[PDB]
Amino acid sequence: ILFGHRYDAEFYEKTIKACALTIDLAILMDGDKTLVGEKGISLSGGQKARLSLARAVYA
Amino acid sequence: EHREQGKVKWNIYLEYAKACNPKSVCVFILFIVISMFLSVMGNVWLKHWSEVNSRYGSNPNAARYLAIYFALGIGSALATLIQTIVLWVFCTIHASKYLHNLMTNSVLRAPMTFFETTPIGRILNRFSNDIYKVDALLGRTFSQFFVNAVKVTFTITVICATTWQFIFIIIPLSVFYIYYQQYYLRTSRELRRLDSITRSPIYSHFQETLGGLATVRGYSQQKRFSHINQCRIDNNMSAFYPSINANRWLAYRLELIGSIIILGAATLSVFRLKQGTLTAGMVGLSLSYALQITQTLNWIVRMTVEVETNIVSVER
Amino acid sequence: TCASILLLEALPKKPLMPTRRKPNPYDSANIFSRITFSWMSGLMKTGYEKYLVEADLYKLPRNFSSEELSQKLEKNWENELKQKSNPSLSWAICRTFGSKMLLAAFFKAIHDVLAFTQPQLLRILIKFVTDYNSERQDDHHPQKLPIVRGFLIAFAMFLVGFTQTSVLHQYFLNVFNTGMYIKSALTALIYQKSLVLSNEASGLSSTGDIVNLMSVDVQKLQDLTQWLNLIWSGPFQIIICLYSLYKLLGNSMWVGVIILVIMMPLNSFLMRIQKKLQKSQMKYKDERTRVISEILNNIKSLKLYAWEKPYREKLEEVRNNKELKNLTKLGCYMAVTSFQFNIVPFLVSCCTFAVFVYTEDRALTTDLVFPALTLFNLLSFPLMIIPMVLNSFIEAS
Amino acid sequence: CKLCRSPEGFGPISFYGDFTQCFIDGVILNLSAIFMITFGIRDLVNLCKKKHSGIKYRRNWIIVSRMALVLLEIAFVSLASLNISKEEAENFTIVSQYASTMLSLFVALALHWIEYDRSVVANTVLLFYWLFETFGNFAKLINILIRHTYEGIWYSGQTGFILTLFQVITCASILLLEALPKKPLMPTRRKPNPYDSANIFSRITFSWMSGLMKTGYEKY
Numbered sequence: 001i002l003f004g005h006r007y008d009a010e011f012y013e014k015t016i017k018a019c020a021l022t023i024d025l026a027i028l029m030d031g032d033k034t035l036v037g038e039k040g041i042s043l044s045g046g047q048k049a050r051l052s053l054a055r056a057v058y059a
Numbered sequence: 060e061h062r063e064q065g066k067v068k069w070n071i072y073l074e075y076a077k078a079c080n081p082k083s084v085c086v087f088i089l090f091i092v093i094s095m096f097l098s099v100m101g102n103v104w105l106k107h108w109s110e111v112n113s114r115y116g117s118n119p120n121a122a123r124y125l126a127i128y129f130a131l132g133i134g135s136a137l138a139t140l141i142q143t144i145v146l147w148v149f150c151t152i153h154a155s156k157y158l159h160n161l162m163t164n165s166v167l168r169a170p171m172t173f174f175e176t177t178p179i180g181r182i183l184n185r186f187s188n189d190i191y192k193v194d195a196l197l198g199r200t201f202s203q204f205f206v207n208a209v210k211v212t213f214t215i216t217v218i219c220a221t222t223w224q225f226i227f228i229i230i231p232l233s234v235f236y237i238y239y240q241q242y243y244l245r246t247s248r249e250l251r252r253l254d255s256i257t258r259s260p261i262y263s264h265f266q267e268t269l270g271g272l273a274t275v276r277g278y279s280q281q282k283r284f285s286h287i288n289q290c291r292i293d294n295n296m297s298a299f300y301p302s303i304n305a306n307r308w309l310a311y312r313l314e315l316i317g318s319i320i321i322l323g324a325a326t327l328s329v330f331r332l333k334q335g336t337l338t339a340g341m342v343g344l345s346l347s348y349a350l351q352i353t354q355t356l357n358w359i360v361r362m363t364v365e366v367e368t369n370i371v372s373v374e375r
Numbered sequence: 376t377c378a379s380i381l382l383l384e385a386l387p388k389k390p391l392m393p394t395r396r397k398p399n400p401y402d403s404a405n406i407f408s409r410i411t412f413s414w415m416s417g418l419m420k421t422g423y424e425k426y427l428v429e430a431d432l433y434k435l436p437r438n439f440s441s442e443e444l445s446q447k448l449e450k451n452w453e454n455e456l457k458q459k460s461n462p463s464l465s466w467a468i469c470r471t472f473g474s475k476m477l478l479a480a481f482f483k484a485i486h487d488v489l490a491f492t493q494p495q496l497l498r499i500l501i502k503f504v505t506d507y508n509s510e511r512q513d514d515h516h517p518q519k520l521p522i523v524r525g526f527l528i529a530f531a532m533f534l535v536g537f538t539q540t541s542v543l544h545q546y547f548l549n550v551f552n553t554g555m556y557i558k559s560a561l562t563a564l565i566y567q568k569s570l571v572l573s574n575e576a577s578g579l580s581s582t583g584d585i586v587n588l589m590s591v592d593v594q595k596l597q598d599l600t601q602w603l604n605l606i607w608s609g610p611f612q613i614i615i616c617l618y619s620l621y622k623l624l625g626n627s628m629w630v631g632v633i634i635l636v637i638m639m640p641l642n643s644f645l646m647r648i649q650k651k652l653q654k655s656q657m658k659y660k661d662e663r664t665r666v667i668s669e670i671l672n673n674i675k676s677l678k679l680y681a682w683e684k685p686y687r688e689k690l691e692e693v694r695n696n697k698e699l700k701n702l703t704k705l706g707c708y709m710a711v712t713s714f715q716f717n718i719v720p721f722l723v724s725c726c727t728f729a730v731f732v733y734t735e736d737r738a739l740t741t742d743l744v745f746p747a748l749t750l751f752n753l754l755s756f757p758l759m760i761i762p763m764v765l766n767s768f769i770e771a772s
Numbered sequence: 773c774k775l776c777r778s779p780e781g782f783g784p785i786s787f788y789g790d791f792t793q794c795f796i797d798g799v800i801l802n803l804s805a806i807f808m809i810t811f812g813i814r815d816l817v818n819l820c821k822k823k824h825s826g827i828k829y830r831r832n833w834i835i836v837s838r839m840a841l842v843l844l845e846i847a848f849v850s851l852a853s854l855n856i857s858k859e860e861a862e863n864f865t866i867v868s869q870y871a872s873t874m875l876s877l878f879v880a881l882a883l884h885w886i887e888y889d890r891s892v893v894a895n896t897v898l899l900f901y902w903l904f905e906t907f908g909n910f911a912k913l914i915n916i917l918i919r920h921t922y923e924g925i926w927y928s929g930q931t932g933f934i935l936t937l938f939q940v941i942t943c944a945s946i947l948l949l950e951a952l953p954k955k956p957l958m959p960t961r962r963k964p965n966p967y968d969s970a971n972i973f974s975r976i977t978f979s980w981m982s983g984l985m986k987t988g989y990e991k992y
C-alpha cells in the first residue's frame with residue numbers, strides 16, 4: 001500500500017477505511033502486517049484490486 | 060541475541076556407519092589403505108630402482124624392475140577400484156536402502172497428528188533431497204575424505220621413515236592445521252549458506268519487477284525499485300565476498316603449512332645427509348611426497364566441509 | 376633491527392583517540408594482510424563462535440557498490456554503442472574490468488613460473504645429494520661440495536612455496552573480484568534496462584528468459600572470469616612443463632604426454648556418461664518423489680483404507696528396482712573413473728620410464744625419476760582442465 | 773659432591789664472562805624447570821578447581837601459536853636430549869636439565885591450555901618460566917658460541933648449537949606471546965583499573981599506566 005511513500009498514520013487509516021479494506025484486513029492474521037504469499041496467492045482477486053486502489057489512493 | 064555454534068553430531072556419523080554395514084566400512088577403509096600402501100610402495104620400488112640405475116652407470120635388468128613397478132602401480136589401481144566398488148555396492152547402497160526403508164516405515168506408522176503438525180513440504184523435502192544426498196553425495200564425500208586422510212597419513216609416514224624427526228615438525232603443524240580446519244569448517248558453511256540465502260531475493264525481486272513493470276514506471280518508482288535491486292545485489296555480494304575470501308584464507312594457511320612441511324622435510328633430510336646416512340633416493344622420495352602434501356591437506360579440509368554439509372541429511 | 380621495524384609496521388594496530396554493520400577489513404588491511412588474507416580472521420572467528428547472520432557480515436569494500444560498478448560499465452557500454460558500428464559487450468566489459476584481469480594474469484604468470492621451479496629445486500637437491508655422497512665415499516680434491524648448499528636449496532624450496540602461495544592467492548583475489556564486478560554490474564544493468572524495456576519486447580522475450588539472463592547468463596560470465604586466465608596459463612603451464620620434462624627425460628617425455636592427451640577424450644566420454652547417468656538417476660528420484668507426494672497428500676484416505684502396505688510396496692518397488700539399479704550402475708562407473716584417476720598418473724610415468732630405459736643409454740637415476748613424477752603431476756592439471764575452460768568460454772559466448 | 777664432568781666446574785662465572793655449562797644446565801635451567809613444576813602444578817590445580825568452565829575468551833591465533841610453539845620447544849628439547857653424546861650422558865647436570873625441562877614443558881603446555889580459559893591476566897609462573905628459559909637458553913647459546921670461538925670446538929656439536937639457537941628463538945617467541953597479546957573476548961561508569969588486568973611483566977614495568985599516560989597527554 002505505501003509502495004515507497006512515507007507512512008502517515010492518519011492518512012493510512014483514512015485510506016484503509018476509504019477503500020473499505022478494513023473488513024478484509026481484519027481477516028488477516030496480522031492485519032496490515034500480514035505478508036501476502038509468494039506470487040500473491042494469499043489474497044482474493046477483488047481484495048487485491050482493492051489493495052491496488054489503496055496503494056493508488058495512499059500515493 | 061545470537062545462537063552459539065554446536066559441536067559435531069557424532070551419533071549421526073555412527074548411525075550412518077551402522078546403516079552401511081560397519082564391516083563393509085572397515086573393508087572400504089582397508090582397501091583405501093591397501094591402495095595407498097601399494098602406491099607408496101610403488102614409489103619406494105621406484106626409489107630402489109633408480110638407486111640401482113645410479114650406482115650402475117646404466118640400467119641393468121630393466122624388465123624386472125619395470126615389471127615390479129608396474130605390478131605395484133596396478134595393485135594400487137585395482138585396490139582403488141575394489142575400494143570404490145565396496146563403497147558403493149556394499150556400503151552406500153546398503154545404507155540408502157536401509158535408511159529409506161526405515162524412514163518410510165516410520166512415516167507411515169506415524170499418527171495423523173504428525174501430518175497435521177508438520178507442513179507437507181517439510182516431509183516431501185526429506186523424502187526427496189535428504190534421500191538423494193545420502194544416495195550419492197554422502198558416499199562420494201566420505202570416499203574423498205578417507206582417501207585423502209589416508210594419503211596424508213602415508214605421506215607423513217614416508218617422510219617420517221626418511222627422517223623420523225619430522226614428527227616433531229608435523230605435531231605443531233597438526234595443531235595449526237586443526238585450528239584452521241575447525242575455523243573453516245564452520246565459517247565456510249555459514250558464509251556459503253548466507254550466499255545461497257541472499258542469492259534468491261535478486262531473482263525473486265526481478266520476477267516481481269517484470270510482473271509489475273508498467274505500474275513501477277507509472278508511479279515513476281523506477282529509481283526506488285532500481286535501488287532495491289542494487290541493495291539485493293550488494294547484500295548478496297556482501298555475503299559472497301566472505302564466501303570466497305574464506306577459501307583464500309584457508310588455502311593460504313594450508314599452503315604455508317605445506318611449505319613449512321617441505322622446508323622441514325628438506326632440512327631434516329639434509330641434516331641426515333650431513334650425518335652421512337642419506338642417499339639421493341631417500342631425499343627424492345620424501346621430498347616428492349612433501350611437494351604433494353599441500354593439495355591433499357586442502358582436499359581434506361574441503362571434504363570435511365562437504366561431509367558436514369551432507370550429513371545433516373542423515374540427521375534429518 | 377629491520378625485522379623489528381617490519382614487525383612494528385605489520386602487526387601493530389593504529390590506535391584512535393576520542394546497529395549498522397561494520398566497514399570491511401579489506402579496506403583497513405596493510406599489504407601483508409591483503410597478501411595473507413589475514414583480515415578474514417575476524418569473520419572466521421565470529422562464524423566459528425556463533426551462527427552468522429546477514430548483520431554479521433562486514434559491508435562491501437570501496438568499489439564493490441553495484442551502483443558504482445553499473446555506472447562504470449554503463450559509461451563504456453554507451454561509448455561502445457555510440458562509437459562502434461558493431462558494438463561488443465565483451466569489449467565493453469573488457470574496457471571496464473580488464474585491468475584487474477591483467478594484474479591477475481601477471482600473478483598467474485609468476486605462479487606458473489614458481490610451480491615449475493619447485494621440481495627444479497627438487498632435481499637440484501637430489502643431484503646435490505648424489506654428488507655430495509659420491510665425494511664423501513671417496514674421502515672415506517679441493518673445493519669439495521659444501522653441506523650449506525643443501526640447506527639453502529631447502530630454504531629456496533620454502534621461499535618458492537611461500538612466494539608461490541602469495542602470488543597465487545592474489546591471482547585468485549583479483550579474478551574473483553573481477554567476477555564479482557562483472558556480476559554486480561551486469562545485474563544492475565539488466566535491471567535498469569528492463570525498467571525501460573518496451574512492453575512488446577518484454578512480451579516477445581518471456582519473463583522466465585529475462586530472469587534467466589540474470590540468474591544464469593551472468594553467473595556464466597562470472598564463472599568465466601575464474602577460468603579466463605587459463606586460456607593462456609594452461610598453454611604456458613604446459614609449454615614450460617614440456618620443456619622442463621624434455622630437458623629432464625629426453626624425448627621419452629612424449630610417451631607420457633601422449634598418454635595424458637589420449638586419456639583426455641576417454642575422460643570426457645566418461646564424464647558425459649557420468650552426467651547422463653546422474654540426470655537419469657535424478658529423474659528416477661523424481662518418479663519416487665511423485666509416488667511419495669501422492670502417498671502423503673492422500674495419507675488420510677490411505678490410512679483409512681490401510682492401503683499403506685501396498686503403496687509401500689509400490690514405492691519400494693520403484694526405489695529398489697529402478698532407482699537402486701541406476702545408482703549401483705552409477706557406482707560402478709564411479710569405480711571406473713576412480714580407477715582411471717588412480718592409474719593414469721601412474722601409467723604416464725611408468726610408460727615414459729619404460730621408453731626412457733629402452734631408448735636412452737643414460738642411467739635412469741633418482742634425479743631424473745622423481746622430478747619426472749612431480750612434473751607429470753603438474754602437467755595433469757592443465758590437460759585435464761582445458762576442456763572445461765573452452766566449455767566455459769563457449770557458454771559465456 | 774660433584775655432579776658435573778666438565779673441567780670448567782660449577783663456578784658460576786667461567787674464565788670467559790659467561791656462566792659455565794654446568795651452571796647453566798645445573799642451576800639456571802634446572803631451577804627454572806623446578807620452579808615451573810612446583811608453582812605451575814599449583815596454579816594448574818587452582819585454575820581447575822576455581823571453576824568448572826572458562827570465562828569464554830576467544831581461542832585465537834595467539835593461543836594456537838602458544839600451543840604450537842610449546843610443542844615445538846618440546847621437539848627441540850627432545851632432539852637435544854638425543855644429541856647427548858656418551859660423554860655428556862655422564863654429565864648429571866646435562867641429563868638432569870633435559871629430563872627436568874621436559875617435565876616442566878609438559879606442565880607448561882597444560883598450563884597454557886588451562887590459563888587461556890580460566891585467567892584474565894597472562895599467568896605469572898608461565899611468564900617467569902619463559903623468561904628464565906629464554907635466558908638460560910640464551911646464556912647457553914652464548915656459552916656454546918664463546919667456547920667455539922676460543923677453544924675451537926662445539927660442546928654439543930654444531931647440531932647441538934643449532935638446537936640451542938632454536939630453543940632461544942622459540943622460548944623468546946613464547947615469552948612474547950605470553951607478554952604482549954591481549955586476551956580477546958567474544959560477545960557512563962568509569963572503567964576498572966588495569967593493575968588488576970596486568971600480567972606480572974606489566975606490573976613490573978608499570979606499563980599498565982600507559983593508557984592513562986596517553987589520555988592525560990591528549991586531554992585534560
Ligand SMILES: CCCCCCCCCCCCCCCCCCCC(=O)O[C@H](COC(=O)CCCCCCCCCCCCCC)COP(=O)(O)OCCN
Binds near residue numbers: 914917918921922
Ligand atoms: C636503542 C639502542 C640500544 C637498544 C638495545 C637494547 C638491548 C641491547 C642488545 C645489544 C647488545 C649488544 C651486545 C654487543 C655485541 C657483542 C659482540 C661480541 C663480539 C666479540 O666480542 O668478538 C668475539 C667474541 O667471541 C664470541 O663468540 C662471543 C659471542 C657472544 C658475545 C657475548 C655478548 C653477550 C651480550 C650480547 C647479548 C645481548 C642480547 C640481548 C638480548 C671475540 O673475537 P676475538 O677477536 O677475541 O677472537 C680471537 C680468538 N682467539
Ligand SMILES: CCC/C=C/C/C=C/CCCCCCCC(=O)O[C@H](COC(=O)CCCCCCCCCCCCCC)COP(=O)(O)OCCN
Binds near residue numbers: 073084202316
Ligand atoms: C600439518 C598436517 C597435519 C596432518 C594431520 C593428519 C590428518 C589426518 C586426517 C585428519 C584431518 C581431518 C581431521 C578431522 C578433525 C575433526 O574431526 O574435527 C571435527 C570435524 O570432523 C568432521 O567434520 C568430519 C570427520 C569425519 C569423521 C568420519 C567418522 C566415521 C564416519 C563413518 C562413516 C564411514 C562410512 C562411509 C562409507 C570437529 O570436532 P569437534 O566439533 O568435536 O570440536 C571439538 C572442540 N570443542
Ligand SMILES: CCCCCCCCCCCCCCCC(=O)OC[C@H](COP(=O)(O)O)OC(=O)CCCCCCCCCCCCCCC
Binds near residue numbers: 416
Ligand atoms: C626472511 C626473514 C624475514 C623476517 C620475518 C618475515 C616474516 C614476514 C612478516 C609479515 C607479518 C605477517 C602479516 C600478518 C599481519 C597481521 O597479523 O595482522 C593482524 C591480524 C588482524 O588483521 P589486520 O591485518 O586487519 O589487523 O591478526 C589476526 O587477527 C589473525 C592473525 C592471522 C592468523 C594466522 C596466524 C599465524 C600465526 C603466526 C605464528 C607465530 C609464530 C611466531 C614465532 C615464530
Ligand SMILES: CCCCCCCCCCCCCCCC(=O)OC[C@H](COP(=O)(O)O)OC(=O)CCCCCCCCCCCCCCC
Binds near residue numbers: 947952970971
Ligand atoms: C635475555 C633475552 C630475553 C628475551 C627478551 C626479554 C624481554 C622481556 C620481555 C617482556 C615483555 C615486556 C612487557 C611489556 C608488556 C606490555 O607491553 O603490555 C602491553 C602494554 C599495555 O598494557 P597491558 O600490560 O595491561 O596490556 O602496552 C602499552 O600500552 C604500552 C607499552 C609500554 C610502553 C613502553 C614502550 C617500550 C618500547 C619497546 C621497544 C620495542 C623495540 C623492539 C625491538 C628491539
